[PDB]
Amino acid sequence: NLPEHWTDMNHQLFCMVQLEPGQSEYNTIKDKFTRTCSSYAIEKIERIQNAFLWQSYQVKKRQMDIKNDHKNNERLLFHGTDADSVPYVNQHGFNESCAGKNAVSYGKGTYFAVDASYSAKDTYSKPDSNGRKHMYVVRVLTGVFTKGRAGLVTPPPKNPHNPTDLFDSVTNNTRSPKLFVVFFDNQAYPEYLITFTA
Amino acid sequence: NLPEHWTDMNHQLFCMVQLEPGQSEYNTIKDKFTRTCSSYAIEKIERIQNAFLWQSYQVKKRQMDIKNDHKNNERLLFHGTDADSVPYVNQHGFNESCAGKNAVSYGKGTYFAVDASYSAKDTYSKPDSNGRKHMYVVRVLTGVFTKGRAGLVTPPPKNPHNPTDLFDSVTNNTRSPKLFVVFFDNQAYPEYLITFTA
Ligand SMILES: NC(=O)c1cccc(N)c1
Ligand SMILES: NC(=O)c1cccc(N)c1
């Protein structure tokens, strides 16, 4: 069940684990970030070990892999947020109330970026008075997707003659996506928290 | 995994099964309904066999039983809806968009009734031109609850000094509840669909 690289949690259902800079796991996440955010300095990277959120996410992933008949349903994406939202996200994941703000709506859902530089905007990873900013690296079940539009509350049907068989997510552009929106709980697992500064 | 009394689904992930009137399972659900709705005539009762919704619900129930350290977290409640919403609910369960309407708000969530007679109101189980009305019997993870209020988007904390440790649901009255509101997916499994008429 729980990932093999996680630390022992001593009966706790949640903990944050600071990664050691210079070691493999920190470097892997740092590189994902610096692909588009190399100008920023990372104060720390924390592994989020949230047993319940992980279990529910993995159940949804198995279901999506069965339904779609392939295992190309997951992306690793980013989500910048304000400091006040971090304790909630760490425990409960992303909800439209705290993770739904956007410049151009592709639907009423939770939004995630392909590039860290998008989530690094101050409108998302709001800096505090000292410029400290927060961004998650998120496992997202994007599955089969289509272009979104304002005012969706669920993804569209794949075929309008079968209104309940839905796309798994929507995007701004199916050919060259920069963001994805998901509408259901347990399609997004907050995997790492990156605290950084201009 | 899947309940023992379900029919074989022949590789399908969802099906509705009409119950035989006069037999045990129909009678058990009918009695739950007639406790407060004996004046109404039941056209049919259908068992909802939704494999994915069931799996995700059961994972959430196990998690709630672990977290609360008891197994008194589930209630059997009711939810009346319009005919146009039934195919979606059967496949995907209840969302605030289709299941959130209420006369007095105890929060922005999905609402369920203790008594069938509440869900039998036309404002919920909207009748069609012929008076046909629809009501679900729903397994709901009410867990530990508190009184709600307008404008909640998640249940309150159990202790405001620990803002992320939340009640599982809210109600109109903790001593004599008539309704419950839940805020997260997978806290409500549509178990039976009752089609009835004045
Ligand atoms: N909060 C975010 O990082 C984010 C990412 C992609 C799109 C939007 N609207 C927000
Ligand atoms: N839709 C319903 O049956 C229902 C049940 C309880 C409360 C509310 N507001 C609605």
Author numbering:
A (entry chain A), B (entry chain A): 481 to 678
Task: Tell me what the authors wrote about this structure, in their words.
PARP15 is a mono-ADP-ribosyltransferase that targets an unknown set of proteins as well as RNA. Its evolutionary relationship with PARP14 suggests roles in antiviral defence; its localization to stress granules points to functions in the regulation of translation. Here we show that the transferase domain of PARP15 dimerizes in solution; the formation of dimers is a prerequisite for catalytic activity and monomeric mutant variants of the domain are inactive. Using biophysical methods, including X-ray crystallography and HDX-MS, we provide evidence for a regulatory mechanism by which dimerization enables correct target engagement rather than NAD+ co-substrate binding, and by which the two protomers of the dimer operate independently of one another.
Previous structures showing the wild-type homodimer suggested a possible mechanism by which dimerization might control catalysis: By enabling the salt bridge network at the dimer interface the R576 side chain, situated at the N-terminal base of the D-loop, might lock the D-loop in a catalytically active conformation. To test that hypothesis, we crystallized the monomeric R576E mutant in complex with the nicotinamide analog 3-aminobenzamide (3AB). The asymmetric unit contains two chains - each with a 3AB molecule in the NAD+ binding site - that superimpose with an RMSDCα of 0.14 Å but which do not engage as a dimer. However, each chain shares an interface with a symmetry mate, revealing chainA-chainA and chainB-chainB dimers in the crystal lattice that share the dimer interface known from the wild-type structures. In our structural model, the salt-bridge network central to the dimer interface is lacking due to the R576E mutation. Although this did not prevent the protein from crystallizing in a dimeric state, analysis using the PISA server revealed a further de-stabilized dimer interface: The R576E mutation allowed a shift of the D-loop base away from the interface, whereby the distances in Cα-atom positions increased by 3.7 Å in S577 and by 3.6 Å in C578. This coincided with loss of multiple hydrogen bonds at the interface. It appears reasonable to assume that these changes together prohibit dimer formation in the mutant protein at physiological concentrations in solution. In both protomers in our R576E structure, the N582 side chain is observed in a unique conformation: Instead of closing off the NAD+ site, N582 folds back into the D-loop and engages with the G580 backbone, allowing 3AB to occupy both active sites. The observed structural changes in the R576E mutant potentially explain a modestly reduced affinity towards NAD+, as observed in our ITC analysis; but this is insufficient cause for an abrogated catalytic activity.
